[PDB]
Every structure is written in C-alpha cells, then in structure tokens.
Design an enzyme around this catalytic site. Sequence first.
Site, PDB file in Angstrom:
ATOM      1  N   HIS A 180       0.790 -10.369   8.932  1.00  0.00           N
ATOM      2  CA  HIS A 180       1.464 -10.129  10.241  1.00  0.00           C
ATOM      3  C   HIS A 180       0.546 -10.508  11.400  1.00  0.00           C
ATOM      4  CE1 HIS A 180       4.444  -7.846   7.870  1.00  0.00           C
ATOM      5  NE2 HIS A 180       5.257  -8.397   8.780  1.00  0.00           N
ATOM      6  N   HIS A 198       1.680 -16.217  11.502  1.00  0.00           N
ATOM      7  CA  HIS A 198       3.081 -15.772  11.250  1.00  0.00           C
ATOM      8  C   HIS A 198       3.909 -15.974  12.528  1.00  0.00           C
ATOM      9  CE1 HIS A 198       6.561 -13.551   9.921  1.00  0.00           C
ATOM     10  NE2 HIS A 198       6.397 -12.679  10.913  1.00  0.00           N
ATOM     11  N   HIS A 229       7.318 -11.595  18.356  1.00  0.00           N
ATOM     12  CA  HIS A 229       8.183 -10.622  17.636  1.00  0.00           C
ATOM     13  C   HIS A 229       7.352  -9.608  16.838  1.00  0.00           C
ATOM     14  CE1 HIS A 229       7.501 -12.986  14.078  1.00  0.00           C
ATOM     15  NE2 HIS A 229       8.037 -11.985  13.392  1.00  0.00           N
ATOM     16  N   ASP A 230       6.084  -9.886  16.544  1.00  0.00           N
ATOM     17  CA  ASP A 230       5.224  -8.973  15.738  1.00  0.00           C
ATOM     18  C   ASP A 230       3.925  -8.643  16.494  1.00  0.00           C
ATOM     19  OD1 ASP A 230       6.501  -8.160  13.305  1.00  0.00           O
ATOM     20  OD2 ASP A 230       6.038 -10.097  12.358  1.00  0.00           O
ATOM     21  N   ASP A 265      12.142 -15.146  10.510  1.00  0.00           N
ATOM     22  CA  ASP A 265      11.132 -14.132  10.127  1.00  0.00           C
ATOM     23  C   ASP A 265      10.814 -14.227   8.629  1.00  0.00           C
ATOM     24  OD1 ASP A 265       9.315 -12.151  10.569  1.00  0.00           O
ATOM     25  OD2 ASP A 265      10.824 -10.546  10.379  1.00  0.00           O
ATOM     26  N   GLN A 316      10.151 -10.198  -6.564  1.00  0.00           N
ATOM     27  CA  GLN A 316      10.501 -11.379  -5.721  1.00  0.00           C
ATOM     28  C   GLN A 316      11.953 -11.799  -5.997  1.00  0.00           C
ATOM     29  OE1 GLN A 316       8.632 -13.335  -3.136  1.00  0.00           O
ATOM     30  NE2 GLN A 316       8.058 -11.180  -3.044  1.00  0.00           N
TER      31      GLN A 316
HETATM   32  O1  LIG Z   1       8.356 -10.423  -0.329  1.00  0.00           O
HETATM   33  C1  LIG Z   1       8.903  -9.820   0.613  1.00  0.00           C
HETATM   34  N1  LIG Z   1       9.690  -8.612   0.418  1.00  0.00           N
HETATM   35  C2  LIG Z   1       9.846  -7.895  -0.755  1.00  0.00           C
HETATM   36  C3  LIG Z   1      11.036  -7.025  -0.843  1.00  0.00           C
HETATM   37  C4  LIG Z   1      11.254  -6.152  -2.033  1.00  0.00           C
HETATM   38  N2  LIG Z   1      10.243  -6.173  -3.062  1.00  0.00           N
HETATM   39  N3  LIG Z   1      10.174  -5.486  -4.210  1.00  0.00           N
HETATM   40  C5  LIG Z   1       8.999  -5.869  -4.843  1.00  0.00           C
HETATM   41  C6  LIG Z   1       8.533  -5.275  -6.139  1.00  0.00           C
HETATM   42  C7  LIG Z   1       9.348  -4.329  -6.761  1.00  0.00           C
HETATM   43  C8  LIG Z   1       8.900  -3.742  -7.949  1.00  0.00           C
HETATM   44  C9  LIG Z   1       7.565  -4.111  -8.476  1.00  0.00           C
HETATM   45  C10 LIG Z   1       6.754  -5.008  -7.832  1.00  0.00           C
HETATM   46  C11 LIG Z   1       7.207  -5.615  -6.631  1.00  0.00           C
HETATM   47  N4  LIG Z   1       8.293  -6.818  -4.045  1.00  0.00           N
HETATM   48  C12 LIG Z   1       9.036  -7.012  -2.960  1.00  0.00           C
HETATM   49  C13 LIG Z   1       8.808  -7.882  -1.775  1.00  0.00           C
HETATM   50  C14 LIG Z   1       8.901 -10.279   2.065  1.00  0.00           C
HETATM   51  C15 LIG Z   1       8.909 -11.610   2.340  1.00  0.00           C
HETATM   52  C16 LIG Z   1       8.913 -12.026   3.697  1.00  0.00           C
HETATM   53 CL1  LIG Z   1       8.915 -13.667   4.016  1.00  0.00          CL
HETATM   54  N5  LIG Z   1       8.902 -11.110   4.750  1.00  0.00           N
HETATM   55  C17 LIG Z   1       8.918  -9.780   4.493  1.00  0.00           C
HETATM   56  N6  LIG Z   1       8.937  -8.916   5.603  1.00  0.00           N
HETATM   57  C18 LIG Z   1       8.866  -7.473   5.471  1.00  0.00           C
HETATM   58  C19 LIG Z   1       7.487  -6.915   5.404  1.00  0.00           C
HETATM   59  C20 LIG Z   1       8.292  -6.737   6.639  1.00  0.00           C
HETATM   60  C21 LIG Z   1       8.918  -9.337   3.124  1.00  0.00           C
HETATM   61 MG   LIG Z   2       8.103  -7.404  12.331  1.00  0.00          MG
HETATM   62 ZN   LIG Z   3       7.647 -11.024  11.437  1.00  0.00          ZN
END
Ligand SMILES: O=C(Nc1ccn2nc(-c3ccccc3)nc2c1)c1cc(Cl)nc(NC2CC2)c1
Ligand SMILES: [Mg+2]
Ligand SMILES: [Zn+2]
Length: 313
Positions: A68, A72, A106-107, A217, A269
Amino acid sequence: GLMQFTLPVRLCKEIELFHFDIGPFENMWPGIFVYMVHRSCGTSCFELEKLCRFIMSVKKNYRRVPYHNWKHAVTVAHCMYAILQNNHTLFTDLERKGLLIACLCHDLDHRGFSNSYLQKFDHPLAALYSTSTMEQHHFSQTVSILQLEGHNIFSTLSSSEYEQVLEIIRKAIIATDLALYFGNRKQLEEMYQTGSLNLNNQSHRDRVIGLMMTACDLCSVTKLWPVTKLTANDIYAEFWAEGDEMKKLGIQPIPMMDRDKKDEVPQGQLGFYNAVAIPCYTTLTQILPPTEPLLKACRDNLSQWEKVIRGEE
Ligand SMILES: O=C(Nc1ccn2nc(-c3ccccc3)nc2c1)c1cc(Cl)nc(NC2CC2)c1
Ligand SMILES: [Mg+2]
Ligand SMILES: [Zn+2]
C-alpha cells in the site's frame, strides 16, 4: 505551456496498454503520472508547477509498506488512465481531472493494516470514522494536501466546479473500500440486466465510477503473470504482518493473514478471482466494452493460479 512530457519509445507505446507495469525506477513515476494527466485531461488541466508540488507532497504522504505504497498509487492511476483513454467520449472534463487525482490519492498514509485491524486495535481513526475507516482518512489526507500553499491544482475551477470535483474524488476514494464493492456490483448487474442503467442518472454514474475504482484498485490481478505473481508477495507480506499483530492482540487471524497457512495461498487466490476479481471486470466489461482486456488478463491469471495448485508450477 509548450512543455510536453515524453517517455522513451517502449513506455510511450506500452503505457497505453492495460497490463503496463510502471517499472522499478521510482524517479520516473511522477513524470509517468504527468504524461497520463496531459494525454487524458490536457496540458491546460493543471498548472505544471502546482501539479508537480502536489504529486511530490502525495508521494511524501505514502509510507514504506510492502504493498500500500507510492508504486500502488501510480499503478492504480495508470489503470484509470487506460480506462479513460479507451472510453474517450463517456466522461466529463471534471471526471477526467478528478479520477486520476482520486487514484493517486486513494491510499494516502496507509499503514498496511485493514479497517478490521484498526477496529480491533481500537485505533483513534476507528472512533473518528466508524465505517470505511482508512478510506475516509485517505480523503481527509487528500483535502489536507490540496490546502497546502501552492498545492491547489483546482484553483482555476469555479466554486461549484471545485465542490463537484472534490465530491467525485470523495465518492471515488470511499468506493475503494472493498466491503462496499459487493453491493455496488450487484446493483450495477441488476441495472444493466433489467436495462435500467442510465449514464445521465448521477447516482448511476457514481456507481459506475465506484466499480472503475475497484477495477483500478485490484489491477495487480490484470498484469502479465510474472508481475501478478511477484505483486502477490507484497500483498501477503502486509496480510501476514497484520496476522502477526492480530496474534499480539490475542486473536487468531483469518487464514489469509496467517503466515503459518502459506500452503493455502493458491486456493485463497482462486476464491478471490472467483468471488471478487472476475465478477468486477465482467460487470465493468458489460458497462464499458473497451475494458475487456482487464477481464481477459484476469482470466489468464486465474488459469495460472489453477496451474500452481496442479503442481505445474
Ligand atoms: O489477494 C487479494 N485478496 C485476497 C482475498 C481473499 N483471500 N483469501 C486468501 C486465503 C484464504 C485461505 C488461506 C490462505 C489464503 N487469500 C486472499 C487474498 C488482494 C488483491 C488485490 Cl490486487 N488487492 C487487495 N486489496 C485488499 C487488501 C485491501 C487484495
Ligand atoms: Mg485502500
Ligand atoms: Zn488501493
């Protein structure tokens, strides 16, 4: 007035593409942003001296966190640039001005922690702003910097044009609160499908700008696989640090933020692409057809995470 920013040939060409990576040379990111404002908005939108002073104060107010950060900010502004450039006639003069600035800001002053962590920590910002805690702070920091002497890039706007652009910026920044995205996209989905979506309806434009803000974002997931993959490391470096701080408060973090559960990242992911990313770029592509490359790149990256699970990498 006659002073154009120009980029080297490879950047000049590739900056037009959605999947462009702004590169590891921090000192070129201000110039890349100014280049995008000049092509997206005009050489007349902003007094160069004020814009340059605004950009450098914004940079200074981003922190040295893994994800962040200032990179970004510029990355999200470039995705907005690409959307605006591919949708020339859809957006007003004030929207083009406001949205690149909104994305850059924005951040602002992000600490690398979620709204959840501030609330569980009982951070002062959580008492000042009960919902969209960090996003109301980001907007507050934006107004603060705009009010520094020689920093008012909007000074040539009328009283009501100024209020409109700051209102565009506020809604745009609030919309980057992912908690608000789910309901925003469902409403846009219903509106597009029942045929009631009307871009002359201001509440409708607001919703569409909101989804553009989510799309920009999240745009790490719309890069070529090596960029997407390496960015994920920075994202999880923050999540795992927050998980550590949750454990210090005596709270088992969600698995997403638990560094002991690294093995579950690939499946995590998949959930994110399927529940957030793909739905986002799909609805965006329905409303703005020329943003299709974002959906295509996102689908390519979903397929790469599937290959990771299957042990093919
Ligand atoms: O990767 C992102 N989000 C996620 C969403 C849900 N899960 N759940 C797991 C998981 C679940 C169980 C075991 C291990 C891992 N990992 C993620 C990653 C992501 C990408 C971008 Cl581009 N931006 C943001 N922004 C927000 C931070 C503000 C977030
Ligand atoms: Mg933000
Ligand atoms: Zn952001």
